[PDB]
Design a protein around this ligand. Structure first.
Ligand code: SPH
Lengths: 278, 235, 277, 235, 235, 277, 85
């Protein structure tokens, strides 16, 4: 984040000290500077690594979900009057890759909700401004089965009531991990199968645990239905704040295939170029 | 007047916000408070009170007063468990509806040691030794006293003191556990076994009952307040 | 200058070299052609501090009984070898009293000293990259995500091998449910050439015969279940293929010796007997 | 109340803004952090780690482990290059997918010295001298050692030390370079030549491999964070 | 939260406003400045540089290099003007396209003294005396030297020094003048006459050229920045 | 009074005379009819300071070997001449060791002393404007924008001539791809009469025989490629046409002598051989 | 290291300074010419590599003349041919 070191002038050298020659077998990166191999002038460095900080790298709102809801009528079976979305950053790739640069992370989160609505037909009248309810459902809490069941009382569940046309809604969340850091990767299982029990029992998905269980968001339109159908989409933008990260990893090189590290397609990411072609 | 810029989040209503609003009844003469007994500042104060566990949720016992009693007898010693519980204080049916479970069902994360208190409600002339065991998760749930004694446990002697407390310590990989049935944050296994057996003399009831209670310890805490699934409304 | 004022309670709402000897317990390792030794992330393994102890019951620390070098099965390096992987503590689950404490307790924690040994003459060629990967998740071999079963994910001291190319398991009736780690993708959809971001050492047969990596206990928790979670993954890849005097068919052994360090176990119960392959 | 004026930019959402928002989980008891090894504060810390270069992207070698190895032999001395690279650490295919390239592809501007480390993976009995050259841009890309020796260069003696580092110094007209193939901000040309040749005795492999690594220096920096082209999503 | 009231002017965009906005590239490492020669802080610094006047905008001379030259000859003395200019530095065609005029065409109001510099580009053997006159407005534009000498003026002797500066003083009823052809803020009249005549010996060119330059003085200033009419775009 | 408070991190978010002798190396210039000498922007040429050095490798400073006066080809001033232009360092690319250092290095930097010489009798007339233009971009001769080729944009010591009127190159098969600098537009769509905003000197034949301009190195970078980028452009225009005694057909030579100053070169390689016209 | 040229050696038999005298510039006490000299320094004071010769069993030896061997070597040869001394 802070200023880089200056460059010191270097003249000709004739000595038994050989910074150029090293041994990478040790696993240590040679900390050479230009003045070690070539003659250098004095440069008072003014560049800084301020935008390379882990905070800056993640200080952007990244779309992570597009939740679709409808306001048509209870009778219509093809219209989804409410939508439940499991909270995760793995429905999108860009933030997922930036995060999976690191094994562990710990950060507060900022959720911004951009709601856009539209008509689906013209010859059924018009609609009044809609209010959307976004109810956070932590794991274990009752999940709505209908758009107007008791669960939406939100006596305890945090809930956001957004008026259409208002600026995108926004909330902040502290670090809510049950562990001391978020696990981008979990090399293990939630169950250990025990000798004796049937192959059906004890079988758990690889890499899946309750560390990444954060509940879901239930989104509905609070208004009663107008004689015409209205389709709305809530876009969720996640911004990490106060980011700490641990154990850097090589970034994803091939397309993601599911919530894990599985790959199936695009296994040839590199193009063809001659060895002696510039 | 003063130049201002409206940031995003303007004109939104967040039910969790904390903003000043105009008073609709200005200059109201508020009735002063009196000292009422039983003031509560923290929900964990309620979670720290022992509440009876509906341990016996069999078909004929559930949703009666019998669901709280666990029947012991003076039969010959056996290594089979008396009762078996899963340490899911919010999602386990036998624990979800205790006061601790009821409070935990308003929160997403919990952490801390628990205490299970067992009360022996046999006659004064009954004697016995029980083994109350907690097994951290990962291994097979103990099916016999021989497995159970390898975990945390207490040997309870039933005498002049008819109650025993076993503290389940906080042994978790994560700093918090979820309040749902979850594999990565699974809690462990509570079990009870006969250490020797229950012995009674003649002219004494050969079947007795134990009552179970659970509560939190002073190191217990919750977070991420949510809506419970124990209450719902229709239409 | 600018002015900042917080209008909320919760802070979340606020704005953003060659000769070496290693003795552990009753085990000793001497090396003369070593390329030094790497301490992963510069952190030496240590015991849980009272300021970070989650479990309350007294831990057990077997010390020398378990903090000692165990040698795994030797593998053979050929010209056609694509690489090998092991999972820790999984590779040590059948190793003395360490495995006993591992299976008798619900929670376990340990760092490691990994010593990879590969001696060859001065007329041999080849380089091995030895990488310690925290949370070394590997890709499966089926269209079903995260479908690898426990038995294959925990091979034990034999570990597994990397593959030249990805093969899809189409057997619907009896799926293999095994890993398919591709060597150039490092088994996790990442280019192997970038794997050097992990703690590592290169065994260049012209320079050194061995590699030593001191892995601290790395995890999002202070202590976890060793049977559920593999803290570390040791991946060995041929960076430069093995070659010798044009004779061909040459193969040299690679031996792996791992010593757990600062072992702590909590939650004693009856022993865990995991289901076998 | 207080007279206010709403400036332009009110009610907008800028994904780069930095504003306070209401907390949706007030009074949450956050799990404290533990000291986890391997903390990273700057992406340039990762960019400073040597990563193997896929130098040999021929048809049969690309997208295999052979793309990282460059084959030397004991043939007679020649002035033709062993390998030729263009100093475009983000847009050059052989450099774009290194860790340095991966980090640079999240940024628009970069500046600083680079280090290329070459490791000789022949037998102990092999000896030779190589010439690793950097030519600042503007002139024809060096097609022979005679041209290459006129630029920055290092003569590498393959002996007891099998690795050599060449620092490409920061020689640019602009204070920053772009992370795309761009003429005005072109970087230069890296090349490798045989200085004398590779000499082996009998009963030794006559063909060996060198591995290439690249990393940034401590004077390296980036700016203008952008979205990378190395990851994409469908539908 | 804090009660606020939205004044009028909220949610407007004024292109002249001065407000803080979120940065789209936070933590960018800005390239430091170097000392580049020729820094400019004020547009009046450019307006203070002499620039050649296109004095001769006749049909065959306009839009060529001849429009800058005014031809003198060795004819007999006459009182008719050599050149006549109207002191409208922004709207006068001969002045509008000078650097002073170009800068003034970005502003609505101007005020200050001007300097006209005339350079004699005849031979060394040519001699003469000219009269450069400024007449404040209000009276008839001087049609002869007899009228012109009653206003501000300078008698220029062409000798070893081939250049003469006449300062047009700031003589205005209003504190500022407009940058358009305007009667109430009209500037005056510049004119040039032969004082004696241009005399040359034999074997010398009998026709010579003078070049005109204009610039502002250190008391010059402009205000009310506007859009110029010297550049336009189509479709 | 008013109050200002910054609510953001990045500062971008914040609200807004006659006898003279010049000796360089082994070259000397004496003048007796000089109109003084102009230092462009009042800045004397200098070497790169350690506080502004972008390249790290040691520069080479040929000093007297290259910091010396080179005389270009003489041009002829007639009544019909429209003007001439040269590009620096392009005009010196074939001048002694300066051009050698220019083509052997990737980066080069130099200021200049430009001395324009035009002597005529006391019975001659005419004035020459000599302008030093930083980034003297010239307009092309085709409907294709920016289509001038490298060979024509870098004529060398001969330079180019201005044109009285703009002519469009309609040859589609073999386009000229040459400049079309119009004298009264200064070759760049700007009136020539305003060209005096640039550093300049006027050679009035009745007053002076020569002009001297000391150009500092001017660029958005501390050092650049001399083969790619021409730092300066020297433009000479007849402000007053040449005339003499009514004889007609008179023509006098104009000679240009340029000395690079404070030459610095970085990035030594094999020599650059640019493609020729 | 001389100018932009560098030579590394690992099997050297030390280095000989002829007559124990290091090369130096002319001193004012010994300057015959009066006009200012030119000292190209790094432009010419740098390593130039000559054509390689082949050593065989039948080779009798080779000779070069200095500065003659460098007359076509960069700016050194240019200064050599542009100056009388
Ligand atoms: C007010 C009701 C609706 C809005 C409230 C929703 C709150 C949900 C916040 C807690 C769950 C998400 C926490 C962080 C997500 C992932 O773990 C991180 N991306 C991990 O890297």
């Amino acid at each position: 984040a802070n200023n880089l070191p200056d460059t010191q002038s270097s003249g000709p050298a004739h000595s038994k000290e050989t910074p150029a020659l090293t041994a990478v077998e040790t696993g240590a990166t040679n900390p050479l500077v230009p003045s070690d191999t070539v003659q250098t002038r004095h440069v008072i460095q003014k560049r800084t690594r301020s935008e390379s900080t882990v905070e800056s790298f993640f200080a952007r709102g990244a779309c992570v979900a597009i939740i679709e809801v409808d306001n048509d009528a209870p009778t219509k079976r093809a219209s989804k009057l409410f939508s439940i979305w499991k909270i995760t950053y793995k429905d999108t790739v860009q933030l997922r890759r930036k995060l999976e640069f690191f094994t562990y992370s710990r950060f507060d989160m900022e959720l911004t909700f951009v709601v856009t609505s539209n008509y689906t037909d013209a010859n059924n009248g018009h609609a009044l401004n809609q209010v959307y309810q976004i109810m956070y459902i932590p794991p274990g809490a009752p999940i709505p089965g209908k758009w107007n069941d008791y669960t939406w009382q939100t006596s305890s569940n945090p809930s956001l009531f957004y008026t259409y046309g208002a600026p995108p809604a926004r909330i902040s969340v502290p670090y809510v991990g049950i562990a001391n850091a978020y696990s981008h990767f979990y090399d293990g299982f939630a169950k250990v199968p025990l000798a004796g029990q049937a192959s059906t029992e004890g079988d758990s998905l690889y890499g899946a645990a309750s560390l990444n269980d954060f509940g879901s968001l239930a989104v509905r339109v609070v208004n009663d239905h107008n004689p015409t159908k209205l389709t709305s989409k809530i876009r969720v933008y996640m911004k990490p704040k106060h980011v700490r990260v641990w154990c850097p990893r090589p970034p994803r090189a091939v397309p993601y295939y599911g919530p894990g590290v599985d790959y199936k397609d695009g296994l040839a990411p590199l193009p063809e170029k001659g060895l002696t072609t510039y | 007047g003063l130049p201002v810029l409206n940031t995003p989040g303007s004109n939104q209503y967040l039910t969790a916000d904390n903003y000043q609003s105009p008073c609709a009844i200005p200059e109201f003469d508020v009735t002063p408070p009196i000292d009422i007994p039983g003031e509560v500042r923290n929900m964990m104060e309620l979670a720290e009170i022992d509440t009876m566990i509906p341990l016996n949720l069999t078909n004929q016992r559930k949703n009666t007063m019998d669901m709280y009693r666990v029947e012991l007898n003076d039969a010959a010693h056996s290594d089979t468990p008396i009762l078996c519980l899963s340490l899911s204080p919010a999602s386990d049916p036998r624990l979800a509806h205790t006061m601790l479970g009821e409070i935990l069902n308003y929160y997403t994360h919990w952490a801390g040691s628990l205490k299970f208190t067992f009360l022996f409600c046999g006659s004064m002339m009954a004697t016995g030794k029980l083994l109350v065991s907690y097994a951290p998760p990962g291994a097979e749930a103990p099916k016999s006293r021989k497995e159970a004694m390898l975990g945390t446990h207490v040997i309870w002697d039933i005498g002049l003191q008819s109650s025993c407390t076993m503290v389940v310590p906080w042994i978790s990989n994560t700093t918090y556990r979820l309040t749902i049935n979850d594999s990565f944050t699974e809690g462990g296994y509570i079990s009870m076994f006969y250490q020797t057996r229950v012995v009674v003399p003649l002219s004494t009831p050969r079947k007795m009952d134990i009552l179970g209670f659970v509560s939190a310890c002073n190191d217990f805490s919750v977070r991420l307040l949510r809506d419970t699934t124990h209450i719902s409304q229709e239409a | 200058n600018y002015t900042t004022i917080n209008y909320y309670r919760d802070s979340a709402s606020n704005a953003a070299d060659r000769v070496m000897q290693l003795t552990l317990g009753n085990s000793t390792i001497t090396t003369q052609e070593a390329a030094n030794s790497v301490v992963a992330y510069g952190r030496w393994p240590e015991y849980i501090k009272d300021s970070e102890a989650n479990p309350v019951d007294q831990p057990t620390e077997p010390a020398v009984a378990a903090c000692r070098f165990y040698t795994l099965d030797t593998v053979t390096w050929r010209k056609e070898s694509r690489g090998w992987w092991w999972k820790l503590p999984d590779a040590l689950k059948d190793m003395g009293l360490f495995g006993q404490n591992m299976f008798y307790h619900y929670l376990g924690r340990a760092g490691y000293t990994v010593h990879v040994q590969c001696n060859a003459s001065k007329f041999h060629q080849g380089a091995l990259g030895v990488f310690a990967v925290p949370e070394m998740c590997l890709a499966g071999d089926s269209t079903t995500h995260m479908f690898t079963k426990y038995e294959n994910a925990n091979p034990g001291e034999k570990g597994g091998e990397f593959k030249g190319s990805f093969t899809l398991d189409t057997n619907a009736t009896n799926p293999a449910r095994n890993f398919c780690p591709v060597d150039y993708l490092f088994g996790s959809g990442v280019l192997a050439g970038n794997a050097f971001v992990y703690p590592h050492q290169i065994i260049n047969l012209r320079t050194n015969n061995c590699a030593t990596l001191v892995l601290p206990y790395v995890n999002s928790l202070s202590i976890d279940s060793m049977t559920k979670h593999n803290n570390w993954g040791i991946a060995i890849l041929p960076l430069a293929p093995l070659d010798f005097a044009t004779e061909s068919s040459t193969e040299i052994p690679i031996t792996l010796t791992i010593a757990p360090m600062c072992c702590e176990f909590n939650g004693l119960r009856n022993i865990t007997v995991p289901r076998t392959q």
